[model samples]
Target: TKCTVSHEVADCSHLKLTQVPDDLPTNITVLNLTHNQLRRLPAANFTRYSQLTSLDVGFNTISKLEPELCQKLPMLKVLNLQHNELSQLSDKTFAFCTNLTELHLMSNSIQKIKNNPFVKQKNLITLDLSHNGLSSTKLGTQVQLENLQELLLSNNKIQALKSEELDIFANSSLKKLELSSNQIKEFSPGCFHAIGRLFGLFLNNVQLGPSLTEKLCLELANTSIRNLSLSNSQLSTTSNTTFLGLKWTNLTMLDLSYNNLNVVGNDSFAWLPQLEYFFLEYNNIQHLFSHSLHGLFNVRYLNLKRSFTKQSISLASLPKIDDFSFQWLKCLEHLNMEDNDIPGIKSNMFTGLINLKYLSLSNSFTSLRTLTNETFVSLAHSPLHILNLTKNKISKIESDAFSWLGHLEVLDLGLNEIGQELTGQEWRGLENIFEIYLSYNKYLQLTRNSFALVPSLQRLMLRRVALKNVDSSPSPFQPLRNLTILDLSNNNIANINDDMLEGLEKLEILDLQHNNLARLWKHANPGGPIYFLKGLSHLHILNLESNGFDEIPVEVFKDLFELKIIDLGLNNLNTLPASVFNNQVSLKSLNLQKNLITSVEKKVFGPAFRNLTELDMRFNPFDCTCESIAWFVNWINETHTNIPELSSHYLCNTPPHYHGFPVRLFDTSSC
Candidate 1:
């Protein structure tokens, strides 16, 4: 009588009632009693609810469940009793729930269960008992969760796992067991042998060490835990006998990271022959032998970083150029060996790797003097898609150095010293390259002949490189008509004059921040007003922050109709004219922080910023006098603008009467 009915579903949530409503519609199939004060189910009152399929009584103070209530609703498929204060569950609570498939008992005070709490719920597939007081010591009941697939025991007080305590679930088809964030320290021998159909075992943030893992392996010897994880457990070592009892030959993932594991024996993972993904990062692994991964025949991705003194891929584990002998990992696809200084990459360094697609070799640690033609003999034979050689001392790149990577799509040569060799047509042979990053190098100038053959280039990043000139006469980027993004930030460019962005018709982003430019508005002819031609009308985002621009011409951006984001912060601009940004109708974000603007006209940004959602005007000296900022003080009260901590980050710097006061708090009506 106190609920709303819609399509035979009753919604009685958020009603301060101490008892369940009895006058609910009889034909209703869904009942929602969440956010109420009901403590128990009215079994006799729900006699007419025989056709009810879902019952959500969560976010209430319910404490008990009766078998008689479940016995009446044989068609109940989903039951939500979350956020209750019940301390224990009886064995015969759900004795007659034969059609129940999903049960939500999460966020409760359930400390114990009568081993057979769900004895008759054979069709139940998912049972969430998380965020409760469940401990292995209180797990005395025997539950025969035969058809259950997922058991969530996270956020509990489970301290140990004994095989006998889980004897009731011997017939369960559980696929995932989440015991993460528990104080579990002991795993009885042959504990997981009962649930042999498990696919993933999550024990993250538990108290299991190497000796405990070796002991736990004996319990999971015959189980089907395809993805086993014991991360952040302070494990020291793993040898052949560490996983000796593991009979799972089809393990697909093994994450042994965030531990104190210093040594991984040659045949440590001999038991898991089908391991596809291996993560061993953030460990104490110092001595890495070649045979340590001798049996990973099907490993697809391997990450062994952050396990050394400098928290990166150690230099000692790199393949020696002279005596390099790699094993046959036929299915290896991606390998990340970054932050390791390999002296040099000679012939056959990666011999049997035929399926590697993406590879990252170095990140400032490799002091590679030059990349000769035969430096990557083995890698050149394969079909790599992406190669990152950023942060290296590679000064020279031979003509035929990257000629073999015909299928490479992305190549990064950032933070290197190889601009001299790239002055000619050396990089022109990369016809399939789509993105190239040659920034932070010694390139004094980018001439017209650069990327002449690489017509498929789409993105070019030259940030922080000592690039002084982008020749306008011959049009250096004339061949790249399909280029979309061009980053020329942190360079030494004097100005972005005409014909510098000649062939970039499809350009979407242009970044020219932190340059030696003192002016964006230039005079093309004698006394002729400088107007930017609509060549870059497709440009959506233009970043020109931290430059030496003192003023902005009203007609400089008259053609950019699709400009969405413009970052012009940290400049010496004094004031702006009205309708200066009238052409950027699609402008969404305007960053004008850290500028020397004393006042801004009310109509300067007018209706041109109709779609402006974010504005950064912080760190600016605002003249808080009512005469100077009268309209803006009221606009902050009426308009819904997203400024970073609006009233706090902005302060008045002038007019001794309102010194250091928030610009938004000043009274402007007196002006």
Candidate 2:
């Protein structure tokens, strides 16, 4: 009863028990006993579960493991003993574990491993011995693990790496070796010669100086290491010959982030011809010449985010990047330079990036006050798709500022200070633009020609732009016939005319929440029912919550036949017409909570709710008299529709004897 069994797996985690549950199914293939108070796992404890293929006993206080436990569960392929008190591993620890493919012993007190401890584990694909007290890499003296693929030994006391220490994996299929966070002071020549076929090597946070880093690169010349990371290795600068030894290797990815690198010399990375991904983020890089990245012809991704700001200064100074700094990266597709201080973009800044697709300069400039037509002229030939320039504090954008980006699809210019530059002409060349985000900017005054050019826009996010001119401008969104989603929440608009959204015949979702639409027709244009939603026939989701509405016109939602969800909560409505939602045959959800209604007339809401699946009409003063809610009491008890919080939220507030009584349980037999 302590464990929960589902199918062939038993999950007994966090039970705080000191022994295994005895009532588990014998044919269970997986057992999870983590976060418990067990001390040891005996062989008899697993004798019944012979079909267990995976066992997890981590986060326990166990000091020793049963030597013959593998014999009882011979089909075990994965064993997790991490975060335990294991100190030593003898030769017989895993002598019978021939089918084990993964063994996790991380975060243990293991300091010694006897000879041939894993000699029989030929199918072991991953062995994690990290976060231990190991001072050497001598896992076993005469072990032959031919199928080992990954070995993690980070966060240990290892100080040196000798060539013979890794001889056991000379003929193995190891692909990744992680030795980071060990502060290794010495790496003997050819120390990685044994695992020459390794594809990844991570030596981050090691105490390797510039000279020693060059030596390590030389030692990894003939290996198949494609991914290498030396982050936080105290590297200060990079010269042209720093990575000269890795010219013959097919190095594809390199991560040197979190270093003290201040400058990158010209041709510094020219030797890595096949490099596809390079990361220099979180460094102190100040200068990058035009030829600094000249040789990488096949690079697809480059991350230089937060690498230009000096740590000592409160304000970040712009780095000196030449005009053609990224001209050689012909195949680069994604470049992220966020949080870096870069000066104004020149006409030829991104000249030769023929295949670039995505670029982000978020928070990378002090203030791009003006965006001229020549700002992005260099990207004319590239097929850039998404461009993110958020948090730039831009105030002005000349006409045809984006005329060069004909292939751009999504443009995010949010968190800026632009007020009057979004008048369709500034987006001349963005013929294929699908989405535009102008949220959190200065006040936006949308004219009738605001989105006349970008007719293909499907989604427009204008949240918190202080929009207040929807009634004055006639059909400001008339050009965007393809817009499917429009977010106008958190604005200062009080009313909208029927012609405001005249051309949006395809709009499906409209967010008008957090506005002042209370008594909209009485204040804006009296003697007329609110007809702003007249043309939106295909609107499926409409949010009008928290608009302080005391009443809504009966014909407001008459044309929204395809509407499925409507939020009218947090209002002050007291009554509704019988035909308020008559046309919404596909309506699925309706929220009218937090209102002032006193009765529910069946003729007003019965036919409209025939196809509704969810209705939230809680927090309303309902009359408990027989004539007022007699049919509602019967409908709530017999209907299959979901009414959330019916017992507590549907309380009555009238007729002295039945005040605060539940409407669903109100007796109506006297009627």
Candidate 3:
């Protein structure tokens, strides 16, 4: 076995290994350390693992590295260092790795990149440095790899790039060049002479800055960039004839999102036949007429998010558009209108979604007064899931709003103001509903007994509802038995009396945030509180952030061994005296990131998170020294990514800081 190999491990495809074990064999030829907990290992340590030909350290925690690490691996040819924490390169880091043909350092911490890092690796063909922290214009000519064929620098912090600097790479052995994610403001005469043989050139995600005139954009007519990804790139500001002189009949995958393109006066892509995916998201565009997508029949996916068209927008009526818009999109499928502020959705608006399956309108709609009856005249009869209308102003919904929706599963109306109501006839109109969200509507009020509408309601969310009262004369949720997730958070309520969430046997997720209730059973009918959580043994997720409390009753959640995630962040508490999160066997995520707690007497959290993968303790202002938090960070390091996910979703309400800041206290020891 090579130095980093262990006999007990078989899953070694992607591990972030930091150290090479010292007990391995000295002269092994094959070493597999792809995705391990790796940070920095000295090159001199590899002298015993010499005969190795394949070495992979991708996705490791290696920040600083010396040049001799390559000189120690003489026989290594394929080195995979992709996705590491390398911030800077010392120019001669790869000068000794002579046998290197492919070096993949994509997704690293490379900020200060200079030329001459390829002095020894002359025969290199594929080099990837995508997703680095490179931000400048002069850094474009930093690599002099004469034998480079494919170079990838997709998502870097580069804000300005010039094609002229890359002219040096023109005469080299370069074939494919990727300069995406950088701020490539223009494609001037700064291009390589090898325009024809250079098969692919990716210039997506860059808007060419705000100063590229039409004359400069038209200059790209001379280059030979066939396969391009201008997705989310602002490029329609160029003149109609900017790319008129190009010969790219072999183009494919053109992404143009986050741009300012509202109209296309010329058929810029009429000459191409092999183009496939077209993306346009968040461009502030109001219309996509037939002429915009004309003559491109071979497109497979077209992304148009934040592209709304009300019947009375500030433009001429697009009357003859449906027949012409998707005239040639014979194989189109997706339509993304997320965060678009679209209200009026007339029929036949999506007339040609024949092969459409996925539709996203999340975080894009608001204050939509009504849902027209004839909205899906052009839409195909397919099962539609994942409908996101998060954070909008949807006040009223027609009774027959979901009349034509047959296969709808997930409907996200979270973070909106949908305060209107629909009678039982409209409520029963919706057939299939797996997950429904109405969270973050602070001033939302459902008048009277409106909760008995859905017979098959599974998950109903009302997070951060700001309800003034928690009880009614007859109770609203008296008929809901199959309700799974009930989120009544961030509201005003003094008590929870009789018939409040009593019949919800299948309740799993209960999120009650920022409600000033003093105690768990401090309601009018406190004796029957245990019956309210009917099937409490099966609850999974529970979030009680910022509830008015000094301490929690330990025995209240004893039967809930099936709970998975819990968030007690930013609450009123002094100390957690061991009995919290009792008998937690199935819990997976625990978030106590922010609160008023000081210390935990030896294992206060206990083994509640034994099967857990995420634990958050950020911004807690714990009185313990940095050493005390050392073990805390160690345990947090072992958790999953959900800790960060919940921290981002923290709700803060103040004079102007409604969404609170996530930072609690920074450790000065690292200073």
Candidate 4:
């Protein structure tokens, strides 16, 4: 084992040992014995370490705790016995530990907490008994837990809860109580009424159906719980008075997701007037009755993703729109309705959400069809920042579809069906747009006026759009002078000459993968107008994979001094030029995978490529002959470069002699 003992603290973690290490000093202040396999710890052990203030024996297999385990360590303030096989804790288990305060017994089979276990330890503040099988609990009445603040009992088999059992923490400064994933079938009235202080409560994945309406409210009516999560608790619906008469004026976050809720009354959250974050994702809610969220004036973030369904729970389809459904959401800044099959959206859908800034309407498997000019009339006067309409079946975006969004920044229309019918002039109102995503639109081509309206656009993604025949003279991206990242992968584009990206001087990341460019920078003439790549000096990442290119120019990336990553995978290159990376000193990641190469020369990797930290050469037909790749074998074993699957994935391919053998283990005796 490796132990570091200094300043009276010792750390012996991540070691392989069966018994406790006894080579430490006697006056150590902290001892970490984690990641071991000791099965028993008796009082006879640790004879040298007696003044330890903290002892961590976690991540072990200890099943027994001797009677005098803590008898000699009077100054031990923290003890960690988690992730063990201990099943029960008796009264005398910790009776001698006078100063033991923080105890961690999580991930144990603690079936019973025997009589007065903490009889004398009055300074205990945090007790973690999570991931256990405790069906009952017992503590000493003499242990006045006025200072105990946190108690975690999640992932247990706690069935019935009685007020007297939890009264053990009565008058204590309890703040956080997590009972998630427990078999809690019943909750006696006023069970937690005695505990006064509560800031956060978690009851997720619990079976609190009919037993949670009133008894839960009556017990925590006086405490100020700012965060409460009752998700996945079999909650079907909430009445106007379900959470009434509770002191919920201080609640700021409420999560009621992953339940069986179908409808929400207008006054459902009237008690929680100070709510700021509300989550109803992955539920069975269908209708958002008028003013359903009327009382949540301060709520800024709301998630109804996969919650509002269609026709019926059994026969659900696209949902419909009602006038008053969201007109009362005055302060909602961010609203997410993703992954819900919303069939269509009209102008008056968001009539009253003036304060809304970010709205996501991207349904992964949606049935949405068209986006007309009147679709966003209600948001014309609002200051919406981000609008995501990806993954929908939008066949047409009528003229002036976004005429009202003057402050829109990011617009995502990817994975949609807005065919060749859409034009660049239809995007006139978006003058301050920065990022525009239109990937996966098969026939979406670029015209000269593609981005003429949004001069401030920085990032543009046109992946898999199939704009095969790209014209050069009338530059399509001439207006985007400040563009930084441009992704044009899978476009079948024939060329990227001077006329293509003329004004994109600040381009950083350029992805042209799966194109038809082979002889780059080798045009017909010397001063040709059809070629230009020297202006993008700030380029960092360049991707040209699966372009069917057998060779690249020697000076292809010489001017890109800041280039750090270049991917050339799935190509037909048999060899690489020595001057391919002549001046690329900052290049770090290089991908040459799935290329038709049998060997690589050592000089090809010059001093300029010495700082490469990531290298990918997998799926290449490498030669493992004693004569070939001799330098590569030495470099692999000596260099500190990170080669993923170096020994297992790099197999021999040539000569039909050492087939399927790892290249890292090639025999070089003849060489």
Candidate 5:
């Protein structure tokens, strides 16, 4: 009864049992006994489950495993013994586990492994022995794990690697070798000569100086290694010949982040001509010469974020990037230089980057106050798609600043200090701009000619810009005929004219939450209904939460026939009209929580809510008498619609005897 069997899997975890449960189904293929008090795994206790293909006994105090345990479970392919107290592995430990494909021994007290312990595991693909006390990589003198694909030895006490110690895996299928978090101080020549097909090698957190780095590169030559990581390895500088030995390896990716690198001399990475991706973040790099990236003609991504802002007595706080620094990376597509203190960008800085598409310079400048026409002249030929310049304190932008970026699609200038410079002339050449983000900026006063250019804009985010005077302007968004989504939340505007959103015929979603809209229909012309949403026939979602609205006219949503979701929570409405949602036949979700309605009649919501999947009417004061909510109480228990918090949030506030009682449970037999 302790184990729960579902579809060929028996889960007995967190039961605190000391032994295996014998009453489990024999046809189960997986048995999980982790987080228990078991200390040993005997062979006789697991003889009934012969069809188990996976067994997990981790997070237990297991110290010993029977030699014949796998003999009974011949079909076992995975075994997890992590966080155990086992200290040694003998030759007969896994003599019959030939079908095992994975074995996890991490966080164990394994100190020694005898020779030929895994001789019969020809089908093993992965072995994880990290967080152990092993002192060397010499598992055996004549090991023969022919099908092993990966070996993880991180967080071990390994100090050195020799050629003969790793000669045992000469012709195996090992593809990944991880030795991170070790104090590896010695690497004999040709130490990786036997690992012919290794694709990645992670040496992070290893103690390797400049001399040892050169030696390590020399040993990694003429192999199949494509990705290498040397982060946090105490590397200080990289000269012309630092990586000369990796010229013939055809390395495609390299990570040198989290180090003390101060200078990147010319031709430092010229030897890695086939490298495609490079990372150098979180370093104290101070100087990057023009020819530092001269030979990386095939690099596609370069991340230099937070790597150039370290201050020292001999070096300035900002990095001094020479002109034409990225002229060699013709195939680069993405570049990230965020969180650095570069002074400014030159006119010819990004020259020859014909294929660059995305660039982010967020929080990377110190005094970039003005953007002239010559600021981005170098990227004239590049078909750049997205450019992010957030948090740059930029106040002024000269006319025709982005005229050369005709192919730009998204421009994110959020979190800046620009106020009155966005008069549709600065975006003169952006003929194909699709989305623009101007959130968290200074106050913005939009006129009728603000978005005259960039007619292809689809999505605009203008939250928290202290927007005002939108009601006075006639059709401020008239130029954007293809705008689909608009976010105008957190602005303290009180009113909107009927013609404010007149020309947005294709607008699908509108967000106007956290504003004052209680006087939306109060000041309108008398005797006629307001047509604020007249032209928006395709509007599907509307959000007007926390707007302090006492009432909304029945004609406010008469044109929104295709609406699917509407949020009107956190308001002061005491009643809702019966025909308020007569046009919204396709509505699926409606939110009206935190209001002051006294009762909900069936005729007000029964017909239009037939196809609705969710209805939220919690936190409302409902009268609990028969005439007030008799029909609603009967429908709430029998209807198929999903009403959230119906038991806890839907309570009564009237009928002195049933105050604070649930409205769904109110008795209506006297009717």
Candidate 6:
């Protein structure tokens, strides 16, 4: 074997190959082959390698390690055989490799490591018998090792860790002892003092009573322990209080994310002067008082999303946060309020977040039914990048809203209607908004000139709005030169004259559908985005469906060289103007569905249809017998227009005899 050097290589491994590679260089210092498919191996597997240092064999099919295999390798250091299907290991099987520094046999088929099993190998430094289906290892009587760095005996059926057996690591070099992920419930008095130099004591994920969290913390108070990870424990209100009594001044980070913590009492967290990172998100805490975070002075990160037990309710218990909770935590950098049902931000809620960098309020806006001015006053100095109030019931938000938000970059007010009325200066409050969303609101129409407010509102969505009968009175969107998306769709208006959408030179998405517009008046601002506007040249989408006009007014047709989709469906004209699409070379979809188009001609194919790629001339009656429309049928059938439902709508308004039928060329053409 070229690369096979370790004699300690024994455990489970999900190897992509069927068997272990035979040519592994034998002088390799460490060999970890976990998660592989190896059915069997010979006892003389490592006979060629002698300088093996460490080996891990987890998740494999090797049932047992032969007793005589390690005799040939004298310098084996560590052995890991966790997560393997083993029930027993022959006693003293590893006696030949006496220079072992660490040994891992967790989650194995062996039941136990007998007392004197390692009597001859007196140089053992560390041993792992965790998750081995063992009741006890009984290794205290034969404690001859002088340099054991750690000992793990977790995930077993052990009822208790005897104080006498654990004292063996006090004089030994054991620094970390983990009896967690097991059935060790109670830690009797003076139980943890047995491991003398123990710096980290991990005893979590065990179904311990509420008193155990505090008990364990108090036991390790004198130890050199620093970090603790306690997730998925059924810890309740009592448990957090118990643990908070321990010395938390030295901890840098504490993780208590997942738990059944129904109630978080005051002084629940022990004083942590040096604590920087804190995570209590996704818990089942039904109540969070204003003083819940009492002593976390130096905390830099706080995550409390979905920490409340009340499903989709208001944050009643967490009223106005006092300034003291943030005094010591002046170094706070980030706060995540995503997915929480925080109904409304109190007037003085964040007076102390001067140093806070990021705030996420984009999750649940319905929790906030009333959008008030004081809601954003606390974030006056905080440089917020995103503020999502989408999917809420904020009915009446005025123009002077957020007059103090100096550094707000984005304002998402989606799915809410803030379009009540505006008599004074529209947006006399807020400073600026680079990106804004007014989409999905029922009252997006301008019954009054509210867009004249909010001078810096860049993008506005009037989707499914009710803009009707464009009038030139009470100031027509005069101050909205920077607006990008003016989605005025799903309304009841008729005709967009020059003065109606006059000053909105920056308007891009102008949706004009379901209106009583009998004709399209002059409505094009292509010559350099009207005046003082930059987005109209970028006006790409225009929907004009469900109108009454037969032909699009020629002037409105020549302006938009960038028009994309013009849905002129369900209108009242038998014929379409060819030049109606003339200077509008960018017209892509022209839907003339269910119109009264009685005739067709190359001349009727106005210049507006020159750039037309899609035209819907369905149900337009052709005067089949008229000598004037001789080439009408052949021209429509040969055009690039795809009229799929051509047979389903009214086709003509022609000669008196045949008034209502699909107008073929004969009856009207012969007259």
Q: Candidate 3 on 556-606: residue-level lDDT in tens?
A: 567677888888777766555567566778878877765765553436565
Per-model CA lDDT versus the true structure: 0.76, 0.86, 0.61, 0.78, 0.86, 0.61
User: Which has the better lDDT: candidate 1, or candidate 4?
Assistant: 4
Candidate 2 on 517-594: residue-level lDDT in tens?
Answer: 787644344756567887898999999888888766777887898999999899888877677767778889989899
Count of backbone collisions in candidate 5: 0
Model 4, 57-132: lDDT tens digits are 9999988788687777778899999999988777777778878779999998877675677767678888898998
Per-candidate clashes, comma-separated: 2, 0, 39, 0, 0, 63
Model 4 scores worst on lDDT over the 10 consecutive residues at: 521-530
Measured by C-alpha RMSD in angstroms, how accurate is candidate 1?
Answer: 7.1
Of the two candidates 1 and 6, the one with more favorable TM-score, higher being better, is: 1
Candidate 6 structure quality by residue, lDDT tens digits, 1-671: 12223354433234454555656665565566767766554557777666666666667777756767577666667776666776655455666767777676676656665555655556776788776667653564744555766778777777765566666555665566676777666666766676656555565677765677777677666665665666656776653357654563276667677776777766666456667788778876655555666567678888877665544435454322333344445667788765655546666666666667666666543356555555676677666666667666677775456666666667777776555544434355556666666666656445445655567776755555565434546445657667666655666665454445555666677766777655333235333121211234566777767766654544455556676877677877764545655566676677766776556665655544555666676665545445535565555455776546545453545555656655433333334
Instruction: Please report the candidate that would top TM-score against the real structure.
Output: 5
Worst 10 residues of 1 by lDDT: 317-326
Residues 1-671, model 1: lDDT tens digits? 47899999999988887887777778999999888888778689789888899999889877777878988887899999889876777766777788999999899887776555676777889988899887763333555667889888988999888777767676777778889889887777767765646788998888777677778877776677788888887777777788776654467888887887777777777676778998977666555566766677889998866554342465445423222334546788988876643456657667778888988876624578777767767776677889989777778776667777888899988778765634545674576889988887876466667668788989999888777547446667878899999898887676445667765779999898888666445334345543433578898999989877776767778778888889989988777877888777888899988899778666686655466789898888888776578877777778666777796888888888778888878876588
Candidate 6 has an lDDT of: 0.61
Per-prediction TM-score to the true structure, in the order listed: 0.70, 0.94, 0.56, 0.82, 0.95, 0.58
How much does candidate 2 score in TM-score? 0.94
Ordered list by lDDT, greatest first: 5, 2, 4, 1, 6, 3
Candidate 5 local distance difference test against the native:
0.86
